[PDB]
Amino acid sequence: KTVLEKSKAGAQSRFDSYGKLYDENINAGENQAMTLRASAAGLTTAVQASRLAGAAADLVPNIFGFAGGGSRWGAIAEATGYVMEFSANVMNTEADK
């Protein structure tokens, strides 16, 4: 009986240890790190978007004033700017989270 009781205690230790880890899905440190990356990602995205929008201010009137594709020579760069600077970056950011 004593041997079985020691076995029981062994299983009980494992049960409680895995129970606790299971319940504490994400630790405090892990939550702080996730929070910081999420905030940094938001800030980073805001910068990429602000930086592009700032530049866009001098491109928009050329985009509007000229007609054509390759012949405008600027609308494509701004459109592709948005696609890589913002859309691709946001998708990858969300995928990582």
| Residue at token pair 């630790």 | 27
Q: Which is nearer to another protein, 36 or 88 (CB)?
A: 36
Task: Count the site residues for another protein by CB under 8 A.
Answer: 31
Contact code string over 13-52 relative to another protein, x by CB under 8 A: xx--xx--x-----x-xx-xxx-xx-xxx-xx-xx--xx-
CA dist., res. 61 & res. 8, Å (int): 77
Nearer to another protein, 32 or 92 (CB): 32
Nearer to another protein, 59 or 76 (CB): 59
